[PDB]
Design a protein around this ligand. Structure first.
Ligand SMILES: CC1=C(C(=O)Nc2ccc(Cl)c(C(=O)OC(C)C)c2)SCCO1
Lengths: 415, 536
């Protein structure tokens, strides 16, 4: 049957414009759509339906098969609340997690007839020689929040049998995804996961994370045989900024060593007073600031800064300077000449963790131009979900600071 | 016999109830005539007292026959009608169309009046033919089809057409049909006979659905006018644009002119309006007559010459490469032209001098590239391979170190000066040997009086008092002088947060003349090392 879904009081349906797509892309979407139409999942619609939602094709890893993806971000935000599952804190303390796209089961369930208009989407034609191919959903659409929700009963239902068979494992459902965390070693782990898939396949369905390795990393200060006027200068600026976080940090003694109009390259002998001040700071920095706890009733935020050479840094927080986590990202083999790719890849990676840890997506502040992003992000996207974002200008200091984060001695030795 | 579309009011508003404008026995008698005809064609229907809605009808005589025609002012009804999905606002672009053996345009003229109205909504389209100076009840009617001027009509007509064509299209894949307004543009690669034959079949098909099609008199023939373009199935040509020679130019004349010129700037290489724009300075009225300077008269003459050149073009062939070449036409301006085969261009164009707050060339090149890319994806659904007047080394060095993410698709270098390059590069580390300038500027933001100066490790010093300045300005001027009075290598320190910006961004253009100056000085130095330090 169909449960009566509605829009939040006074909300109207999305009417978002279809961004232009690639030919390759339009071909696949058409293909896809005809099939679904045939399968009865979607129907062509009339002009009396003024709504719209963007759409696009992504790549299902390992296959040439293009995956259909819709931008339900607006609909989701306009869809009423169902007053999801409580986040299993244990998940983050698991040795290895794996994700699965269980969005496929949604088709099985019908969508309330009165809500379908709001599912209106469109297939564009190159050079707009042809009008858009309008459709609307008849079933549960993937990437829509209401789907995993309506599908809960059935979901949990099919799940139990495995959960009991293996109670040491934790399963979490976010949108179209399923993240499974266990403390079993790689093989026994994946075998058990496949065992899960088989289990899921007898109905109709179808990343290797390691949360416990997600170390909280500190800020390491430079150490030198000798220090120059400039060296110190840079150092002072950084710590002076740093004081907004750890108010115990002090640069007074150092600032006295900066008294005098000397050559930037000239060496300054460190006073013991200044030297203590430095060690006191190293001590403060040695650990994350106190009193920081995650607020479930507050928007989660994620900022990123392009560090260069394929390197990047991020800070998830809810209050400025009050970070829940900070980390870095190195470009993945192959992305060497593409900035957008490395970026999208990161946004995804961060987002996954955000889900894994607090069970939601952060809101991104991206060090990139809107036009650059919009024009090429889809090309490298891979997640069923799409997080919220804003484009920003990176304050030079913030970057400089986090650039100071500590890295391994040698690294995670993969013998 | 076509399925009506379900139409509703807004949000719960009400149908229009505007009163009928008073007309003369003459204007009335004409409307009475046309409406009896429409009544019989089945387009409208006489109603009675059961209708409070109404729209004003009017009587105008057109040129074609000077014959009395009619018009119904739907403005209100329209503002009360629900919203529909956007009608095709993105029209095809000539450069994107493909070349065809033949192309025919069919005119589904008053097809608006061919599609049935949603029987329910019909009462809202009610209007009234007045009586001789408000005598007893005038004649009442309502539409039963898509009204000329009514809000829904366009999107509806379009859809209707789309279904009706689905069959035909499915049957002959090798036939392309374009819908625009009341025009069907059918082309092919078939033999003209086969083609003309299929045209007929298609027509007949329409006929089945009541879709009356052309009379040889109204028949349009190639080439076709697609806003600024004349299209022949073999190729396109840009319409010969005319600049009138006069001895009296109003501001209007100059603006309109500048406009037309600007449009041509996309196609024709060489156009300029600098001296023309200049004439607009301090204008007091549109009807104001501004005499052309010698320079104005000159460029106007050069332009007439260029405009008398036949710009002809090529269509899109999906089997060949899509190529885009760019030229930096002076600072902030970029020219591009997309061709698959040398000298045979599909599209060309240039992007205006984007007067921003502060950037650089490489960034600007990038932004041009993207604008282009976007256009391409819409036009051909493919991005063109790029030929760029910048070295791959310049690219690598800039991008790999910039604070903001950026990217240029698959591209290739083409040495067509001027080439874009980095005007300077702030040092990575302070310079050993070079002098150090500890700069500083302070101004009272309220008295706008300030001073700026420096003290070097070498002994040199200076201060300069400034009136009608700002603190930001001073800080900068400090830096300016620093560069001015320094040799080829300079180490400058400052607490100006903005300079931090310049360290990160290293712009080579800015909205601020001052900054610009500094840039000039920067570019001039053999080496410069900026270092920022917290103030106070
Ligand atoms: C011939 C053809 C198509 C085409 O790709 N080229 C193409 C080539 C020349 C013309 Cl004149 C047209 C045409 O229909 O004119 C438009 C600009 C109004 C289209 S698509 C629609 C059907 O016909």
């Amino acid at each position: 049957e169909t449960v009566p879904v509605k829009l939040k009081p006074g909300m109207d349906g999305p009417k978002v414009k279809q961004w232009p797509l690639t030919e390759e892309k339009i071909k696949a979407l058409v293909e896809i759509c005809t099939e679904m139409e045939k399968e009865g999942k979607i129907s062509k619609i009339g002009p009396e339906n003024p709504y719209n939602t963007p759409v696009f094709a992504i790549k299902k890893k390992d296959s040439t098969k293009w995956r259909k993806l819709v931008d339900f971000r607006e609909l989701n935000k306009r869809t009423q609340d169902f007053w999801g599952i409580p986040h299993p804190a244990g998940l983050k303390k698991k040795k290895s997690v794996t994700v699965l796209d269980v969005g496929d089961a949604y088709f099985s369930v019908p969508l309330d007839e009165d809500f379908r208009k709001y599912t209106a989407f469109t297939i564009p034609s190159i050079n707009n020689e042809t009008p858009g191919i309008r459709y609307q959903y008849n079933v549960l659409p993937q990437g829509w929040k209401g789907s995993p929700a309506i599908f809960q009963s059935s979901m949990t239902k099919i799940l139990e049998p495995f959960r009991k068979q293996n109670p040491d494992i934790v399963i979490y459902q976010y949108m179209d995804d399923l993240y499974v965390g266990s403390d079993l070693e790689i093989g026994q782990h994946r075998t058990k996961i496949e065992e899960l898939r088989q289990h899921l396949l007898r109905w109709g369905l179808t990343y290797e994370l390691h949360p416990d390795k997600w170390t909280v990393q500190p800020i390491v200060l430079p150490e030198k045989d000798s220090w120059t006027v400039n060296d110190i200068q840079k150092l002072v600026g950084k710590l002076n900024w740093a004081s907004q976080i750890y108010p115990g940090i002090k640069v007074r003694q150092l600032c006295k060593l900066l008294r005098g109009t000397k050559a930037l390259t000239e060496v300054i002998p460190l006073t013991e007073e200044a030297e203590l001040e430095l060690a006191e700071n190293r001590e403060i920095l040695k650990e994350p600031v106190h009193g920081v706890y995650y607020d479930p009733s507050k928007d989660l935020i994620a900022e990123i800064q392009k560090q260069g050479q394929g390197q990047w840094t991020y800070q998830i927080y809810q209050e400025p300077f009050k970070n829940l986590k900070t980390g870095k990202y190195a470009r993945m083999r192959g992305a060497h000449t593409n900035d957008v790719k490395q970026l999208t890849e990161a946004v995804q990676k961060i987002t996954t963790e955000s889900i894994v840890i607090w069970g939601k997506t952060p809101k991104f502040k991206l060090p990139i131009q809107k036009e650059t992003w919009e024009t090429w992000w889809t090309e490298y996207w891979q997640a069923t979900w799409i997080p919220e974002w804003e484009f920003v200008n990176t304050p030079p200091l913030v970057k400089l600071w986090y650039q100071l984060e500590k890295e391994p001695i040698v690294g995670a030795e993969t013998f | 016999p076509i399925e009506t579309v379900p139409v509703k009011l807004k949000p719960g508003m009400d149908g229009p109830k505007v009163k009928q404008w008073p007309l003369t026995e003459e204007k009335i008698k004409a409307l009475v005539e046309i409406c009896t005809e429409m009544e019989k064609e089945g387009k409208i229907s006489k109603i009675g007292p059961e209708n409070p809605y109404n729209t004003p009808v009017f009587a105008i005589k057109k040129k074609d026959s000077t014959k009395w025609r009619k018009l119904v002012d739907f403005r209100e009804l329209n503002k009360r009608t629900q919203d529909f999905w956007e009608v095709q606002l993105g029209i095809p672009h000539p450069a994107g169309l493909k070349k065809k053996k033949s192309v025919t345009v069919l005119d589904v003229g008053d097809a608006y009046f061919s599609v049935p109205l949603d029987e329910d909504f019909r009462k809202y389209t009610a209007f009234t033919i007045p009586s001789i100076n408000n005598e007893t009840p005038g004649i009442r009617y309502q539409y039963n089809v898509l009204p000329q001027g009514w809000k829904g009509s366009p999107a509806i007509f379009q859809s209707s057409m789309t279904k009706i064509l689905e069959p035909f299209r499915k049957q002959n894949p090798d036939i392309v049909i374009y819908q625009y307004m009341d025009d069907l543009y059918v082309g092919s690669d078939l033999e003209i006979g086969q083609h003309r034959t299929k045209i007929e079949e298609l027509r007949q098909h329409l006929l089945r659905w009541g879709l009356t099609t052309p009379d040889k008199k109204h028949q349009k023939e190639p080439p076709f006018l697609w806003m600024g373009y004349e299209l022949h199935p073999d190729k396109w040509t840009v319409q010969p644009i005319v600049l009138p020679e006069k001895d009296s130019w109003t501001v209007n004349d100059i603006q309109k002119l500048v406009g037309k010129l600007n449009w041509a700037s996309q196609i024709y290489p060489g156009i300029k309006v600098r001296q023309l724009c200049k004439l607009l300075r301090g204008t007091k009225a549109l009807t104001e007559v501004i005499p052309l300077t010698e320079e104005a008269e000159l460029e106007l003459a050069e332009n007439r010459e260029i405009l008398k050149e036949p710009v002809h073009g090529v269509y899109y062939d999906p089997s060949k490469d899509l190529i885009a070449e760019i030229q930096k036409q002076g600072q902030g301006q970029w020219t591009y032209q997309i061709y698959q085969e040398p000298f045979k261009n599909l599209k060309t164009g240039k992007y205006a001098r984007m007067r921003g707050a502060h950037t650089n060339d490489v960034k600007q090149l990038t932004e041009a590239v993207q604008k282009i890319t976007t256009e391409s994806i819409v036009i051909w659904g493919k991005t063109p391979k790029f030929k760029l007047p910048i070295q791959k080394e310049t690219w690598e060095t800039w991008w790999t170190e910039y604070w903001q993410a950026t990217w240029i698709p698959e591209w290739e270098f083409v040495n067509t000066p001027p080439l874009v390059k980095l005007w300077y590069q702030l040092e990575k580390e302070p310079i050993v040997g070079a002098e150090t300038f500890y700069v500083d500027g302070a101004a009272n933001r309220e008295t706008k009086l300030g001073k700026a100066g420096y003290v070097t490790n070498r002994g040199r010093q200076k201060v300069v008092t400034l009136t009608d300045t700002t603190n930001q300005k001073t800080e900068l001027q400090a830096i300016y002088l620093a560069l001015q009075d320094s040799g080829l290598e300079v180490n400058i320190v400052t607490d100006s947060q903005y300079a931090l910006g310049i360290i990160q961004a290293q712009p080579d253009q800015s909205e601020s003349e001052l900054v610009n100056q500094i840039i000039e000085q920067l570019i001039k130095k053999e080496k410069v090392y900026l270092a920022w330090v917290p103030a106070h």
